[PDB]
């Protein structure tokens, strides 16, 4: 049980106590999947208004 890295200031102090030793998608890829979902939405909307047109 040893203390380490004792730093002290006026606001407080810090230290470590050891008890025992041991033993991304690009912007274009984002915008495409965003627009791929938007197209799926408008396909769904087109099929609806076709159905309603029928």
């Amino acid at each position: 049980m040893e203390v380490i890295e004792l730093n002290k200031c006026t606001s407080g102090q810090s230290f470590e106590v050891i008890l025992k030793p041991p033993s991304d998608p690009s912007l274009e890829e984002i915008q495409k999947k965003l627009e791929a979902a938007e197209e799926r939405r408008k396909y769904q909307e087109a099929e609806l208004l076709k159905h309603l047109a029928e």
């Binding site: 049980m1 200031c9 407080g12 230290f15 041991p22 965003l34 938007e38």
Partner: protein, 438 residues
Amino acid sequence: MRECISIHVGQAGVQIGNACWELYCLEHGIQPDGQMPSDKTIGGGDDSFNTFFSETGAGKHVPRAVFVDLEPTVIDEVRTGTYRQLFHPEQLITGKEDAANNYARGHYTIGKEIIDLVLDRIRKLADQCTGLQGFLVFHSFGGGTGSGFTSLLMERLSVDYGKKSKLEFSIYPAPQVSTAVVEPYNSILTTHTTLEHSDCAFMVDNEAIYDICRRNLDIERPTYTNLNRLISQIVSSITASLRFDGALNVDLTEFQTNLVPYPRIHFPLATYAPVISAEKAYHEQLSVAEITNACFEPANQMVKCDPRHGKYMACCLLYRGDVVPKDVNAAIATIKTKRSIQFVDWCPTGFKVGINYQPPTVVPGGDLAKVQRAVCMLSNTTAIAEAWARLDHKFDLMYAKRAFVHWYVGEGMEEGEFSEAREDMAALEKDYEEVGVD
């Protein structure tokens, strides 16, 4: 000095953020007007509190914060609250209609029409920063904005600020504070697409906060105001090292270094003590030993789980108030002989301790009693995976019948994202078990 930008997303994120900044002003002595009498360098400075506050030539200290919600009801109260003139209009960003507790609606449909403007308002703040550290992102798991928009924002922040750190404060869904039945869906979906973009995430289960407020504050049915003021106490103790002089966790990167040996397992468990009701006139003040021992009672954790049946990989102790290093090590020595505290074999069994002498600040008239010393423990234990198991089980029950799925598909999401996000959580669950059980 290096600056930190806070981003509050959705109702939960915004209301928690307003509770945190309220507390920050009380702690740093900033009035609702933005003026700070004790700040002697007018209109500038490199002090540690300026990591969270910029300064105007007129002496106003302005949060480095962005609020964003897809409906204006919540942010409008920020615009008309006690701290109304703390912020500028451009920091508050409103939509017209919200994500209706639909991840897909917040991520895909409504997200796309707002993400560019949010990033542009984030950019205005980052341009007023000499060296920017990264971001602290507040949000709910269950809201459609909190889950769907957050994950899109986090994706784009990794692209626009690839070398800056990103920390989350995430509200885990609890049915007792009114809950949409689809919050398990949104939680998993947002965790999956945010995981590789978040360096450290502090989960707060509303169930734990709710029961603490009932047990220790004797509030029979807590409100969001009761929950958020307690939450901000914890948040403040976690961020106090960023806003005050010190040597532990002075950098957002220190959080990952000190608490996250493996990137995917970046969900430290927070435990806080003491929580004492302000209606108790005199309360026998608890010692260093008694509040430190309370950090190992599940009843004080932000997430209900049993650390005894898992393994530790890191543990930080953040004290506020009258505390001396020797009291701490005396309290740790005794606690170790009495508690089941097993670390992973490939990690040192120890504690990183941080003490700030200023005791906790409490909102005048709030529910929390002033205390002479408090502690927040941040421990990365595999036991938190219990919370992933609960959420994943409910996800599984609803999804087996595809209940409510049509709401997400109808916004342009495909069913495959459901099982893709779920398989990611299945990997995360066994990541935890390989690390923590023999």
